[PDB]
Amino acid sequence: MEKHLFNLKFAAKELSRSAKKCDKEEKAEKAKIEKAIQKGNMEVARIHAENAIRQKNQAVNFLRMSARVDAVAARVQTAVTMGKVTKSMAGVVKSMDATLKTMNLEKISALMDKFEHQFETLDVQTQQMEDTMSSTTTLTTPQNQVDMLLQEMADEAGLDLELSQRLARLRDQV
């Protein structure tokens, strides 16, 4: 339908250009009327006068035809565009039908439960990894040094937040 839409728009442009050239030839023939009356040729003046009236009414007819063809070309153009929209929406319907039959809501539910449980197991994995990575390097991070360092650098900012011997003697008791 695009070829016929192109031909209707081209026909409307041809009718509009015909109206333009007839309105130009009307002014040319009126200048010729003035020159013929200045020369005194009344039969030449009448020929150019009927030419000018013909070009005027002819331009009105081409303008009205161009208006009608432009109306029909506008409606054929929205026909072509909404047909393209219809074909694209039918393609969307069949592609979603394919994807929603190959991946149901039950398969989505199972896939998402498996997703969540595998990240639970992975978080347990990284927890015991970090536990081993702390226990391997316990000797470079004593807990007392980290505690006293936090106390020092919190007292510097103004925030304000032995036992082994006692427990050894108590194990010696019982």
Partner 1 sequence: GFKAERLRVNLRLVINRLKLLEKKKTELAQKARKEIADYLAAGKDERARIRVEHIIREDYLVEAMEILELYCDLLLARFGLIQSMKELDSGLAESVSTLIWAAPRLQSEVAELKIVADQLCAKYSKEYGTVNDRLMHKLSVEAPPKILVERYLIEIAKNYNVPYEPD
DSSP reduced 3-state for 140: coil
CA dihedral for 71, 72, 76, 77, sign (positive or negative):
negative
Positions of chain breaks in the chain, given as the residue before each break (C to N > 2.5 Å): 161
**Residue 37 in the binding site for a copy of itself (CB under 8 A):** no
Q: Which 32-71 positions form the footprint of partner 1 (CB under 8 A)?
A: none
Minimum CB distance to partner 1, residue 42 (Å): 15
**Residue 150 in the binding site for a copy of itself (CB under 8 A):** no
Q: What gap in Å lies between CA 139 and CA 106, rounded to an integer?
A: 51
In the list a copy of itself, partner 1, none, the entry touching 102 (Cβ below 5 to 8 angstroms by class) is none
Choose among 53, 27, 24, 49: nearest CA to 36: 49
* x/- track of binding to a copy of itself for residues 40-79 (CB under 8 A): -x-xx--xxxxx-xx-xxx-xxxxxx-xxxxxx-xxxxxx
**Residue 93 in the binding site for a copy of itself (CB under 8 A):** yes
Q: Which 88-107 positions form the footprint of partner 1 (CB under 8 A)?
A: 105-106
Q: What gap in Å lies between CA 165 and CA 113, rounded to an integer?
A: 52
Binding site for partner 1 (CB under 8 A): 105-106, 109-110
